[PDB]
Amino acid sequence: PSFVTFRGEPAEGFNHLVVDERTGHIYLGAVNRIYKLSSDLKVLVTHQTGPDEDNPKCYPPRIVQTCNEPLASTNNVNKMLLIDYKENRLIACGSLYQGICKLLRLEDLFKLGEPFHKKEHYLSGVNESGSVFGVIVSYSNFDDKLFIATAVDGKPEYFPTISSRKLTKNSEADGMFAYVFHDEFVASMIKIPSDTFTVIPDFDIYYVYGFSSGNFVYFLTLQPEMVSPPGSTTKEQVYTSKLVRLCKEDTAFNSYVEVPIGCERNGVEYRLLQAAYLSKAGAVLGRTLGVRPDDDLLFTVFSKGQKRKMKSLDESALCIFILKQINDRIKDRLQSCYRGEGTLDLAWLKVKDIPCSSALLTIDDNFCGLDMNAPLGVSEMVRGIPVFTEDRDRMTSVIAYVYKNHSLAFVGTKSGKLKKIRVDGPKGNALQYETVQVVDSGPVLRDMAFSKDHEQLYIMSERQLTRVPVESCGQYRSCGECLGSGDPHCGWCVLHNTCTRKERCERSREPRRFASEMKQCVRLTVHPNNISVSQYNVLLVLETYNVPELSAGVNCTFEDLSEMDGLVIGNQIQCYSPAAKEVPRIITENGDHHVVQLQLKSKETGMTFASTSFVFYNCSVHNSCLSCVESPYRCHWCKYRHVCTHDPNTCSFQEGRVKLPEDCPQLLRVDKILVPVEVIKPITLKAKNLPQPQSGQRGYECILNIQGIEQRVPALRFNSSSVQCQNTSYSYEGMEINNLPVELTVVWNGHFNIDNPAQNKVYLYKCGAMRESCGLCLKADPDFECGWCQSPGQCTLRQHCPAHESRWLELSGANSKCTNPRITEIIPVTGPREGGTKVTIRGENLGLEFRDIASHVKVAGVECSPLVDGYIPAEQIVCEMGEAKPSQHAGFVEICVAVCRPEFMARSSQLYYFMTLTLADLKPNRGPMSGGTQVTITGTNLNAGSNVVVMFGSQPCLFHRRSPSYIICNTTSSEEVLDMKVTVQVDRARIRQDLVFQYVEDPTIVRIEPEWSIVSGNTPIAVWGTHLDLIQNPQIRAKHGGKEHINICEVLNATEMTCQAPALALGPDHQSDLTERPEEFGFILDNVQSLLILNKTNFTYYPNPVFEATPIILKGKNLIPPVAGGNVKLNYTVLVGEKPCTVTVSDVQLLCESPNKVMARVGGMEYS
């Protein structure tokens, strides 16, 4: 729905709004315009008040007298607007006339009169809108008047800030705006003293809001710094927001009172009035407030602090004042002055403090003021009761009203939104809703009035008036949701089945017709909660509470699917379930069950109000016993029929029924089923509740699912708990894998598969496709029972190999020597003469125990001692060689399993070679103390042996790769000190040499020569620092956004370095024209971490170019960066397949010339 609105008919401007109590017509004050609108916000009539040639400086405006100062067409701002019902007109006071007021006829806006001639006819020079306010009070003839306050602008002689003026019947009459009682000594007006102006130059009173109460008139005002804040001389101005009051009856103006007003929230001060609204509490607020029905209340809005009235702060607070409380404060104050204590204390009015005079008096609320102790101020600032505070978005305006005794408050925001607040201090709670009827971008004005009928609330913006309805409960579909939202306006109109306010619900007054709390809803229950799919048209009884008389008629709707008529008896509703034809359409694909929300559709409303959980459960679909019983519903399984059904009778016979899950037909597991290939073997099985096949039903079979071949073997069911497939042999083709698990399915009567929860499988295992050697077989599991058979030269089970001799060989428990050990290959081919090398020998048929191999290994003559942990039985031996000093140079490796028997020994195919590695030189001789330098150790025979360790200063170096000629390793920190020695140890040999490594102090980065670069980077950067030579490959690092990137540097001297800037190019973020710092910037110099992130750096990144696909003109953004100084600019080159062109570069375009595919390049970037 959209909100009805009136756009600034003059699209040009807007200032004030008011509603006629009887008609509902809305009058809107604006600059140069005054409009009359319908309740709907249609334009009824437009009046042109505007642009008049004038000048603010001139006193009696041009019409009366000639003004020396030049005039200009200026805008006339509607300062004020007030409806004079009695007079049947509208007082629409403008400005730019020296503030002349106009009278517009109520119905047509016909200008009845606009008195210009006399001085009184001029209100104020002030151009500002809303700084003025006032009230029109009327009585029958010979009793009457207008009270108005306005800012002066330092005009003190010309105009009074507050005045009591006359409103004659005739608009033509000269008398208008004359003071009620004018005397040479005292007039019914209050002027600002000249002395006060001189002291504080700018002092001025701005009147925000005003209202008549009882028999007085109140004004909320803003004033300047007068003793607040203290200051010897003029400087800054801060404001103090105060309340003013007058007796309607006091022609003398003696009754004037002025108290400062504000409120504080947790030590935060809210001094400045934005707007206010007088209203009633209604029964709810009044009771807890402790008030009489008639007693009034004043909602207000204040900004934080004393600063900037012109443009206040966002922080704003809605406070409250009970009029009784303010009246008390005033009475309290007066009764005090009458005591004779202290001074009057009103700075702006009376510069010189006059004392209060004591006197005998009955001080009442009626007290109008007396000659002595005349106009007076107030000491104690009156504090208000806080209600709601907005930090993020400043409140601009407020209104409130009584609804069903609950007090609803309306608050405009700077954003153009309205808040609907139930005030519940006296009750208990907070803010119910927020709305943006208005204007999404920018604010709402103080003139915010409810309509006469109080259906809507006209919300005024600078641009437009918007008719915001006071609730939009209709959005809520169900009683549960309606009451769920909580926005206090909403209730569930039971019979209507809709969500709306009390006023909206017909006959809501009657009992249980309207529901306020969730409890009142609606609660529904169905006796047959669960009905089976198979059943049809079942009788259901409905129990509902807290529902209105249904005699209108009701229908039951399971869902959008179906709807059945119902009859009512007692306090119950009787409906029928859907037909089988209807029910399964739903059930299909939901499977196990489908919960459905059965609703009740009322005949009168035609909307579903009440719901319940209704379950549709069909047993037959279940394919297996587990699903049938074990599932969530009541279903019975028939072992024999092998079907699931609701009825017990349908089962084959009594013994066949499965009520419990434990009882179901399933196969129990036994020790793993091992099955050799090509062997005839029976496979016994255990299980539970196996059915006896009934008539027309066949027996049991075992089906093995082997991809190569699926075997069907019939079986015998001995009893309810045991089965056995008959003697058969199984095989799979491939010889690929030893152990193949296979799924097996036990079936009976052809298709019926018995459930296999464990999912037991049969393991088909085959004898050495894999192992040609005796060592390999004995190595394999003892479970296989597979063993080596000497005569065949092959390996199979005893069953498989004939026994000429009493024995076939099986590793009894590893105590089985094997024969014919072989060595395939060994690692470190070469080694040092000194020894210590770790030789890794890999063979096929070795000894099973370590103990036998130990002492077995020899390299030629040299004794080699094997390592226990390293040794993997019969596959591999890790051995450490001893001192090689012998004459041989090269020798074959020998392993004797237990004993060096002739059958039992193995010799290596290739011989182990002895040679002593040496190291001549290191590529970097020097490096930083922190370390992290890539060292290049050059030498000979560096590759030898097993293990390598490099120690600089006895501290370890981190190894990388090894070669015959070279060892590469990364240096550790020389915490010790500059200089150091290099020791390399391979196995037991430790070689040292004269070559030394010299430690040099961590490098530093002083400065970066351009402070900046572009998004794509690759510009030159001249960096300066210290100990730069110490790092071989320095690089620049930068982190922009999520990603981190690096780039290369070239080191000239110890001090100087040239680096190419890193590319930032990121699709998500682009550097702004202004420029941006990276998340991190630094340099990667080995381990020195401090260099990685530079805290101090103010390096900035400027925006790679964007280009879009006869001379050539290429357009795109980001061609030129805003860079400081010089025309440091990018050197662009647009080239064709090979030739560059002459071009003039502009920020937006590139003017290349082609006399006859293109590539554009600047620095590092290329685009095509």
Side-chain angles (χ1 to χ4, degrees), residues 974-992:
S974 180
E975 180 183 11
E976 291 193 13
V977 70
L978 304 299
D979 195 279
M980 81 86 258
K981 53 289 97 183
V982 59
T983 181
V984 62
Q985 294 179 18
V986 58
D987 289 302
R988 59 198 31 136
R990 180 199 57 214
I991 64 167
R992 66 162 182 129

Side-chain angles (χ1 to χ4, degrees), residues 724-736:
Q724 180 176 167
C725 317
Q726 297 302 87
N727 293 275
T728 185
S729 62
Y730 304 96
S731 293
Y732 56 94
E733 57 193 321
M735 295 181 292
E736 298 163 301

Side-chain angles (χ1 to χ4, degrees), residues 623-625 628 636-645 648-659 663-665 688-700 717-721 748-754:
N623 187 62
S624 64
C625 191
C628 183
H636 308 113
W637 178 256
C638 189
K639 294 169 180 184
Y640 293 95
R641 273 164 35 91
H642 192 81
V643 174
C644 179
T645 61
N649 195 278
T650 192
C651 181
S652 63
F653 42 65
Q654 297 173 5
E655 60 190 290
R657 303 179 185 143
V658 177
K659 284 179 169 189
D663 288 351
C664 286
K688 281 161 180 157
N689 294 149
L690 289 177
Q692 185 177 351
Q694 294 294 294
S695 294
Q697 294 172 11
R698 294 190 302 145
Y700 287 90
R717 180 180 60 84
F718 297 102
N719 52 105
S720 297
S721 62
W748 57 274
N749 196 4
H751 287 79
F752 302 109
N753 180 13
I754 299 72

